[PDB]
């Protein structure tokens, strides 16, 4: 019965609801907090954003090295800073 309103998604939420918010060419993980002020907390700290794509921590993908042509395995490590690595495999 306490709610939040998110102008980016245009939706109204209940305290405790979690949802994705597209903003600044990223996806954010948002939580409706409420706290007597319709507080929303949103974070990209559990994601990586690379190459026009949003990844979650733990995601892995493979792609050729753009110059070398050999295969890479990429991983979203996150670590509070969108840290990804791509390792030749």
């Amino acid at each position: 019965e306490e709610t939040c309103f998110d102008k980016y998604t245009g939706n109204t939420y209940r305290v405790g609801d979690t949802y994705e918010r597209p903003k600044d060419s990223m996806i954010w993980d948002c939580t409706c907090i409420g706290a007597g002020r319709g507080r929303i907390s949103c974070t990209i700290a559990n994601r990586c954003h690379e190459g026009g794509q949003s990844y979650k921590i733990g995601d892995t993908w493979r792609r050729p090295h753009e110059t070398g042509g050999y295969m890479l395995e990429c991983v979203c490590l996150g670590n509070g800073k969108g840290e990804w690595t791509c390792k030749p495999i």
Partner: peptide
């Protein structure tokens, strides 16, 4: 080499709005 990237140092990762 292993390629690597991360968010800009000055990008805030967690924000609150009321």
């Amino acid at each position: 080499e292993t390629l690597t990237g991360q968010y800009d140092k000055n990008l805030v990762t967690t924000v609150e709005e009321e």
